[PDB]
PDB file of C-alpha atoms and ligand atoms in Angstrom:
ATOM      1  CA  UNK A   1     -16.326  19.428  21.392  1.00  0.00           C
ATOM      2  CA  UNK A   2     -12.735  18.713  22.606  1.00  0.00           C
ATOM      3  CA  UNK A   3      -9.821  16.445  21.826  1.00  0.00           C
ATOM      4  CA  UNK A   4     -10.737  13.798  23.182  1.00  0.00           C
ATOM      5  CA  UNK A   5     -14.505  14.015  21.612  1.00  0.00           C
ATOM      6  CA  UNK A   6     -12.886  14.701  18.414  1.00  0.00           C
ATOM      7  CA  UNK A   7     -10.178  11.728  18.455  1.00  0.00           C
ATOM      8  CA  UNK A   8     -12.926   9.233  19.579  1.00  0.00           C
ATOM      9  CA  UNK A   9     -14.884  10.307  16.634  1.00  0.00           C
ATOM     10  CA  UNK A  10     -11.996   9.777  14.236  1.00  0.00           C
ATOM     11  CA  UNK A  11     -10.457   6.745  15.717  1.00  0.00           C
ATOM     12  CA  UNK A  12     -13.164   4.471  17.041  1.00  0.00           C
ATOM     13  CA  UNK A  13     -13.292   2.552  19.703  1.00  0.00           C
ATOM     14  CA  UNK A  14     -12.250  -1.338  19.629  1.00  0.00           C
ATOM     15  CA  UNK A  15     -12.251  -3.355  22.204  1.00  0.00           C
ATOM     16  CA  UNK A  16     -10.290  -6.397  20.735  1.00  0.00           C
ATOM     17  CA  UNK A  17      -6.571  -6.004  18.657  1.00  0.00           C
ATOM     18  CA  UNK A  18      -7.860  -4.864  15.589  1.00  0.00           C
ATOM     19  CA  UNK A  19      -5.393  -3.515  12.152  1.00  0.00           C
ATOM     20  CA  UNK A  20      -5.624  -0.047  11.706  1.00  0.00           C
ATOM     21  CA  UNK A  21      -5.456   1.692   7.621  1.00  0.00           C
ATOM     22  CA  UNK A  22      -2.214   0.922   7.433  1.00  0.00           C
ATOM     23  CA  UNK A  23      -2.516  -2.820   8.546  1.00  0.00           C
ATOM     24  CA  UNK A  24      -0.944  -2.645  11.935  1.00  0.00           C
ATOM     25  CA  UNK A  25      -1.888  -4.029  15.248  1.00  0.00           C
ATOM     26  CA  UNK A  26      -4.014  -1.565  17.186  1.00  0.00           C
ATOM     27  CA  UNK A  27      -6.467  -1.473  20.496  1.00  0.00           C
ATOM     28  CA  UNK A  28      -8.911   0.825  21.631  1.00  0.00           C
ATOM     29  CA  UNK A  29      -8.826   4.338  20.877  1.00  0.00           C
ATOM     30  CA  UNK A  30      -5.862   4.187  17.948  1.00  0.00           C
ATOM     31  CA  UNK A  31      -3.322   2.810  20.409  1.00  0.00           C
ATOM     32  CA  UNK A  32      -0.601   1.257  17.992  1.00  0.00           C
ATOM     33  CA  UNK A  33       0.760  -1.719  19.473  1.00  0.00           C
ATOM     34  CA  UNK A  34       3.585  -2.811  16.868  1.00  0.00           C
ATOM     35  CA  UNK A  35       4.637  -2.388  13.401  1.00  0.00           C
ATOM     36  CA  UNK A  36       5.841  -6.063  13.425  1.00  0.00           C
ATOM     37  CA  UNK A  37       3.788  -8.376  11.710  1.00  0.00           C
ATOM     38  CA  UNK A  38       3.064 -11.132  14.243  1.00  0.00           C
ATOM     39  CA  UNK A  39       0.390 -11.184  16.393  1.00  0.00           C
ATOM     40  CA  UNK A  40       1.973 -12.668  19.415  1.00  0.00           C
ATOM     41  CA  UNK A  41       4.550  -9.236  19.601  1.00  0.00           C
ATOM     42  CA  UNK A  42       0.867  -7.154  19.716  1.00  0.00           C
ATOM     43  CA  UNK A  43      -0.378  -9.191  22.701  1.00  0.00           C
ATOM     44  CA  UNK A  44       2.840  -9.121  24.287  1.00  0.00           C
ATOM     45  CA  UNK A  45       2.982  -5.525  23.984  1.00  0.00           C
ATOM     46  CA  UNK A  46      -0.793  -5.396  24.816  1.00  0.00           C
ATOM     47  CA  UNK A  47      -0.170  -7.211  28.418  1.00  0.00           C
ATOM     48  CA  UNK A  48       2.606  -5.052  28.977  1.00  0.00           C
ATOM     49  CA  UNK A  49       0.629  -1.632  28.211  1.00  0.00           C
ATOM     50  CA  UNK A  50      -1.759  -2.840  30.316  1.00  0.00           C
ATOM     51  CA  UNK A  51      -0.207  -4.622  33.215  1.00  0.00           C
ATOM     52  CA  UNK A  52      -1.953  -8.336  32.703  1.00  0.00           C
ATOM     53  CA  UNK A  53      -2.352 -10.799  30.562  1.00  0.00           C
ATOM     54  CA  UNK A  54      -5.270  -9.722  28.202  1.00  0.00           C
ATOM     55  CA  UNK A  55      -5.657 -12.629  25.582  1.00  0.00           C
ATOM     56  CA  UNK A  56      -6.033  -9.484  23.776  1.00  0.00           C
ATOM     57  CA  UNK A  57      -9.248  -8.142  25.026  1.00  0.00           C
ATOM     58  CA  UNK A  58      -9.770  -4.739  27.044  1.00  0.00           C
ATOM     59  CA  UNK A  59     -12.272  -3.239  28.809  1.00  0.00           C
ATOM     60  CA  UNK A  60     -13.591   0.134  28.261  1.00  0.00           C
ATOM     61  CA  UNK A  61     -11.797   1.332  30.934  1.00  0.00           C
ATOM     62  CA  UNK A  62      -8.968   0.026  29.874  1.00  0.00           C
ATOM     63  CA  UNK A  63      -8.953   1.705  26.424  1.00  0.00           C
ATOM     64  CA  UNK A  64      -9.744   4.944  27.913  1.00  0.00           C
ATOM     65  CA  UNK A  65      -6.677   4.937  29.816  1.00  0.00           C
ATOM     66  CA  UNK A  66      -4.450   4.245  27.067  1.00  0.00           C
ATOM     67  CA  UNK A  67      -6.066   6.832  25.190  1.00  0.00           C
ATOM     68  CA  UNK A  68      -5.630   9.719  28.099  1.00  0.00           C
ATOM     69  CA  UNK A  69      -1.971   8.771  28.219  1.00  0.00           C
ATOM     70  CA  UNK A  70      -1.975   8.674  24.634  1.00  0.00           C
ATOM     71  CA  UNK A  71      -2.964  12.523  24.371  1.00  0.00           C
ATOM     72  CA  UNK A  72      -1.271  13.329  27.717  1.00  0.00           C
ATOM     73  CA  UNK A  73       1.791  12.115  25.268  1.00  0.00           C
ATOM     74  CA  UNK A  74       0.723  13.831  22.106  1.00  0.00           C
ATOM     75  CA  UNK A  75       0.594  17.264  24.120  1.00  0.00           C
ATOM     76  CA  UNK A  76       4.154  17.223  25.471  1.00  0.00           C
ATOM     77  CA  UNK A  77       5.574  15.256  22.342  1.00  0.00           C
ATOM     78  CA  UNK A  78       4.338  18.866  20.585  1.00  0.00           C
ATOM     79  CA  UNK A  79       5.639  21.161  23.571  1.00  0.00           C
ATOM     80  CA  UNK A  80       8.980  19.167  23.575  1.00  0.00           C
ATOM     81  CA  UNK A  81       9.500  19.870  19.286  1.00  0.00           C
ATOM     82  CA  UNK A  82      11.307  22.695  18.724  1.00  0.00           C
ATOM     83  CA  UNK A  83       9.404  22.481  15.494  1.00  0.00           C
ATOM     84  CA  UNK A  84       6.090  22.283  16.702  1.00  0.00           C
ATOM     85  CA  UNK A  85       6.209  24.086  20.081  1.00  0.00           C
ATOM     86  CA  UNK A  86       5.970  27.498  18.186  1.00  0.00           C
ATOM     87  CA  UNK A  87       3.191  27.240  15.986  1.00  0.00           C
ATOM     88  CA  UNK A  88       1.286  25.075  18.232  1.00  0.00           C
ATOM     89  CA  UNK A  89       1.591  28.426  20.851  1.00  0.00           C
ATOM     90  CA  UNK A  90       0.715  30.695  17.997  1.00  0.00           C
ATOM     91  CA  UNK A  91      -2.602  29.243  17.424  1.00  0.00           C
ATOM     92  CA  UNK A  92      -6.262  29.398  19.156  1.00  0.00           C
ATOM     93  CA  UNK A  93      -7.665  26.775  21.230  1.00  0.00           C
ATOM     94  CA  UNK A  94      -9.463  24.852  18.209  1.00  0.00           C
ATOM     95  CA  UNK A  95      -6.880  24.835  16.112  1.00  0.00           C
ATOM     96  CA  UNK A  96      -4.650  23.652  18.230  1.00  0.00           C
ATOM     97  CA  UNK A  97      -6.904  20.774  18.573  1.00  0.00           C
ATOM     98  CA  UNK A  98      -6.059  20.074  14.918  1.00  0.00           C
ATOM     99  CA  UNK A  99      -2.613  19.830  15.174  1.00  0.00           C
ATOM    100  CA  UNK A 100      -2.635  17.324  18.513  1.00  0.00           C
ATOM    101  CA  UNK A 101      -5.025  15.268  16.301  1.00  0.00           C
ATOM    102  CA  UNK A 102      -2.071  15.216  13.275  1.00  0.00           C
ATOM    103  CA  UNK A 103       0.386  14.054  15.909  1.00  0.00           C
ATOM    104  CA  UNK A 104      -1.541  11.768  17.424  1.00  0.00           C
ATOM    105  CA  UNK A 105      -2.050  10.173  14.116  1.00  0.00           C
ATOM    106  CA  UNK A 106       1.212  10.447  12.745  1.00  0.00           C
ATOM    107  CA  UNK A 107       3.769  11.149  15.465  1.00  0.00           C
ATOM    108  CA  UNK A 108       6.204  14.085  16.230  1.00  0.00           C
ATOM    109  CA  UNK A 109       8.649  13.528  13.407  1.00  0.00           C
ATOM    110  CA  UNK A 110       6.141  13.136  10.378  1.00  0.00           C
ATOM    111  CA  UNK A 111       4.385  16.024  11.602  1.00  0.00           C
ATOM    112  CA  UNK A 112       7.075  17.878  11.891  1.00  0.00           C
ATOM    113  CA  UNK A 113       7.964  17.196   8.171  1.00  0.00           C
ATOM    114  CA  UNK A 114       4.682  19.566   7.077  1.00  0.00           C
ATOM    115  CA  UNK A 115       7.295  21.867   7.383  1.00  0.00           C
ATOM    116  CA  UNK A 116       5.615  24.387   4.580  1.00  0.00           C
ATOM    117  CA  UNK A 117       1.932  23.780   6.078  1.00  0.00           C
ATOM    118  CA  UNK A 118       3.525  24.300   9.951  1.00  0.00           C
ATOM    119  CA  UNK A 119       4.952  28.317   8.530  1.00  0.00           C
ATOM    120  CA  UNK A 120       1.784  28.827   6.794  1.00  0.00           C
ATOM    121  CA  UNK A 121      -0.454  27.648   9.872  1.00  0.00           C
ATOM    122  CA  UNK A 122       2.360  29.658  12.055  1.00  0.00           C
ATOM    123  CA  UNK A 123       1.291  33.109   9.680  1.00  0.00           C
ATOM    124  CA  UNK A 124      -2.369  32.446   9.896  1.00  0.00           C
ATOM    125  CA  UNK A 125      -2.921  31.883   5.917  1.00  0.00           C
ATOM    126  CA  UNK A 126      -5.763  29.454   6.546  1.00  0.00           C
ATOM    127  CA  UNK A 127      -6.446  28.758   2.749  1.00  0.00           C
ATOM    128  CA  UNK A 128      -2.905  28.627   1.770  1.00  0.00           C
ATOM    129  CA  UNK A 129      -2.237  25.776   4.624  1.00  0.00           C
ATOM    130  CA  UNK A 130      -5.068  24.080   3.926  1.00  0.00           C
ATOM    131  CA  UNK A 131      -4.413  23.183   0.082  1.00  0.00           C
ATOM    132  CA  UNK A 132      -0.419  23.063   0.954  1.00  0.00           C
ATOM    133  CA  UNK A 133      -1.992  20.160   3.922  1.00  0.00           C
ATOM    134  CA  UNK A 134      -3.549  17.911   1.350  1.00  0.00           C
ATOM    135  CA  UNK A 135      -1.450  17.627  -1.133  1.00  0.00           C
ATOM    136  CA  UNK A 136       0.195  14.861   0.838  1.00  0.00           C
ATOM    137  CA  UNK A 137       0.058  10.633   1.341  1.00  0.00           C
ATOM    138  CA  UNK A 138      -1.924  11.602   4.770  1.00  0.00           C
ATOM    139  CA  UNK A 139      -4.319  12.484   2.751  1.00  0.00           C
ATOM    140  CA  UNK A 140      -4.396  11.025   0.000  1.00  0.00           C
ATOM    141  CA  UNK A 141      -4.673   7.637   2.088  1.00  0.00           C
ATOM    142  CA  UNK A 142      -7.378   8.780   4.540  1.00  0.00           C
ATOM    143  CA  UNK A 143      -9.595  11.468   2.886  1.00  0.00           C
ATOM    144  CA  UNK A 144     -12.235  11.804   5.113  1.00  0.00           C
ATOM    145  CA  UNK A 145     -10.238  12.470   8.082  1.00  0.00           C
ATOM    146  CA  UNK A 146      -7.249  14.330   6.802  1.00  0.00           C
ATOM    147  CA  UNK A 147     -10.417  17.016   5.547  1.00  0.00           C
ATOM    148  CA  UNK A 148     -11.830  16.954   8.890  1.00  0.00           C
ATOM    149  CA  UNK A 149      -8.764  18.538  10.274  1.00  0.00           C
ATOM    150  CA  UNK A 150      -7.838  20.130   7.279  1.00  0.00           C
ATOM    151  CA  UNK A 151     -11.256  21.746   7.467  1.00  0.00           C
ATOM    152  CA  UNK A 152     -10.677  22.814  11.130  1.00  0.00           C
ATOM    153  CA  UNK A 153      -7.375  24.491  10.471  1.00  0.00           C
ATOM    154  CA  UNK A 154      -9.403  26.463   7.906  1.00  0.00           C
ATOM    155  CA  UNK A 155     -11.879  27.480   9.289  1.00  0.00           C
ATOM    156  CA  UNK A 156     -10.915  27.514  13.619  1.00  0.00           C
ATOM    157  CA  UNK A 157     -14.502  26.067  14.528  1.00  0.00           C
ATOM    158  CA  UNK A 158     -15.462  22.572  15.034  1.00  0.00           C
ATOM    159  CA  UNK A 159     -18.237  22.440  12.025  1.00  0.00           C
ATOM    160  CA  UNK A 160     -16.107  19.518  10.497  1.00  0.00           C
ATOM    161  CA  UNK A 161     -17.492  17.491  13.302  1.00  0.00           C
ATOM    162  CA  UNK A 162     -20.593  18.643  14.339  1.00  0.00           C
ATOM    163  CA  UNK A 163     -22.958  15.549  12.820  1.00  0.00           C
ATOM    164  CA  UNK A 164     -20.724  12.494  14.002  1.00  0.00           C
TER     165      UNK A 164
HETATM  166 CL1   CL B   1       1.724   2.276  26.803  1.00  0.00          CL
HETATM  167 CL1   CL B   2     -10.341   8.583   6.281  1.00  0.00          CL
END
């Protein structure tokens, strides 16, 4: 297992503009288009993501390039945050895995906001972060996930996903 393994399991793949939990215009693997409410804006920011005009269909190809720039993104977005830069260094290699997952999800800034979860992941109190981590709208809107990766940060292996 890996990021990318894990992501694909939690995001799906989708082929056509789809709208994600939160009802907003999406393609591929989780690749937000727009917040706006039309259509059109999605497949104009669609064609201009992917350099032609889609109709809004991708190939597979396609949506795996938007995803590898997606967690190329992710990565950095983390490194850049003076926030997030020092726990994500603290941790191990699996957990870490967690917390690129959270961002992609959710972005820099509202993963920066966990910022009681972020000291307790940053002193290594596992149990402590996890039940701080769910008492939140992230999880409270998408259960099964948000336990995934709350269950990761717990526990540092990738049992959560092993099954899927
Ligand atoms: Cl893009
Ligand atoms: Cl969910």
């Amino acid at each position: 297992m890996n990021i990318f393994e894990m992501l694909r399991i939690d995001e799906g793949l989708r082929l056509k503009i789809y709208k994600n939990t939160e009802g907003y215009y999406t393609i591929g693997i989780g690749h937000l288009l727009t917040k706006s409410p039309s259509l059109n804006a999605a497949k104009s920011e669609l064609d201009k993501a992917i350099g032609r005009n889609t109709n809004g269909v991708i190939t597979k190809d396609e949506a795996e390039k938007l995803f590898n720039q997606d967690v190329d993104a992710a990565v950095r977005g983390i490194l850049r945050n003076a926030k997030l830069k020092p726990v994500y260094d603290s941790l191990d290699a699996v957990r870490r895995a967690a917390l690129i997952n959270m961002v992609f999800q959710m972005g820099e800034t509202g993963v920066a906001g966990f910022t009681n979860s972020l000291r307790m992941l940053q002193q290594k109190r596992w149990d402590e972060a996890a039940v701080n981590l769910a008492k939140s709208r992230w999880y409270n809107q998408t259960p099964n996930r948000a336990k995934r990766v709350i269950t990761t940060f717990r526990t540092g292996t990738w049992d959560a996903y092993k099954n899927l």
